Amino acid sequence: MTMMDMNFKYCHKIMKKHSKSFSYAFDLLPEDQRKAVWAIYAVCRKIDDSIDVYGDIQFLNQIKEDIQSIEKYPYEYHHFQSDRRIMMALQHVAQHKNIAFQSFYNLIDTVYKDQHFTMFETDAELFGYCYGVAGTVGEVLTPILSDHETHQTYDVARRLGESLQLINILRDVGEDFENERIYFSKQRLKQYEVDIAEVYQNGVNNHYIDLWEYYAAIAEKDFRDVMDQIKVFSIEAQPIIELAARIAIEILDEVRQANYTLHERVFVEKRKKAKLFHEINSKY
Ligand SMILES: C=C(CC[C@]12O[C@H](C(=O)O)[C@@](O)(C(=O)O)[C@](C(=O)O)(O1)[C@H](OC(=O)/C=C/[C@@H](C)C[C@@H](C)CC)[C@H]2O)[C@@H](OC(C)=O)[C@H](C)Cc1ccccc1
User: Fold this and answer.
1) Which structural domain range is residue 264 located in?
2) Distance from the CA of 77 to the center of ligand 1, in angstroms?
3) Which of the residues 103, 112, 237, 277 could staple to 139 if both were Cys, CB 3.0 to 4.6 A apart?
């Protein structure tokens, strides 16, 4: 192992321990792309953690400054302030791919702002947040998942990330509620007559199913459009991106099968993921 190998292996360790769902898919990719994805995943997880868990603006400030050092001087040796091994790997990636640094900065700002979770007033603000935490990630991942760095490729990758964020929301509403988080907008909860705490206590009702399915329909339409444009991605990523769309839809059906429960985390079995992947890439 070279030292750089050890940096990527560390990034992999972070992905493998925490990623119950992304990890299976992304490790189906070829080696250079897989490694780049590990470094991006590790950096984004550290960003998300810094606030949610380790509890400091300064660690987040350190991450931003490290990324800024890489952008300004991609070939200089930096004494990274945040996590050395992760930043060395990201710098290696940036020497080989066009990283959309402003997307990292948008992500960091969104994570900062989320510190004080004010509920979203409008779907526009919810979707603005889906962009900030996940559209941005799709943007970062674009030059890794594709050889085309056109408007269309970034737009598809952004939409894929934001829709994945919406699936995540739809799966985790109970868990999120326990953590003092509601992502459905106040405008939409008000329209559908849903109080999450009330539902958490008294079971799923029809007003809630309707609200949930309103947002699920948005997610499903967005995935169909991503699938329509699968070919903007590289030939090796296409099957993996298709699996992601598919698992996303499978999660929506599991929630539905579990009658929209707020009291367990539905998940797609690893064996079933393999079944879905097999089905998919026989077409390739
Ligand atoms: C913090 C983040 C993780 C949030 C997350 O936390 C969970 C948890 O902490 O428990 C998680 O660990 C888990 O559920 O196990 C999970 C995971 O599986 O990874 O990770 C969850 O994912 C899913 O639920 C996936 C559902 C399927 C539909 C997946 C399809 C697409 C099959 C391919 C997700 O909520 C993100 O960063 C920010 C800024 O949000 C990434 C790091 C961003 C990134 C993503 C990919 C590449 C590079 C960067």
Assistant:
1) 1-284
2) 31
3) 103
The CATH number of whichever domain residue 227 belongs to comes to 1.10.600.10
Q: State the distance from the centre of ligand 1 to the C-alpha of 20, rounded, in angstroms.
A: 8
Q: What is the 3-state secondary structure (H, E, C) of the chain?
A: CCHHHHHHHHHHHHHHHHCCCHHHHHCCCCHHHHHHHHHHHHHHHHHHHHHHCCCCHHHHHHHHHHHHHHHHCCCCCCCCCCCHHHHHHHHHHHHHCCCCHHHHHHHHHHHHHCCCCCCCCCHHHHHHHHHHHHHHHHHHHHHHHCCCCCHHHHHHHHHHHHHHHHHHHHHCHHHHHHCCCCCCCHHHHHHCCCCHHHHHHHCCCHHHHHHHHHHHHHHHHHHHHHHHCHHHCCCCHHHHHHHHHHHHHHHHHHHHHCCCCCCCCCCCCHHHHHHHHHHHHCCC
| 264 neighbors 258 (Cβ within 8 angstroms) | yes
Query: CA 121, CA 146: separation in Å to the nearest integer?
Result: 36
Atom of ligand 1 nearest to the CA of 240: 33
Domain total in the chain: 1
Tokens of 234: 């590289």
Query: Which resolution in angstroms does this entry have?
Result: 2.1
* Cβ burial, residue 141 (10 Å; 0-12/13-18/19+): buried
Query: Which residue's CA is the closest to the ligand 1 atom numbered 9?
Result: 18
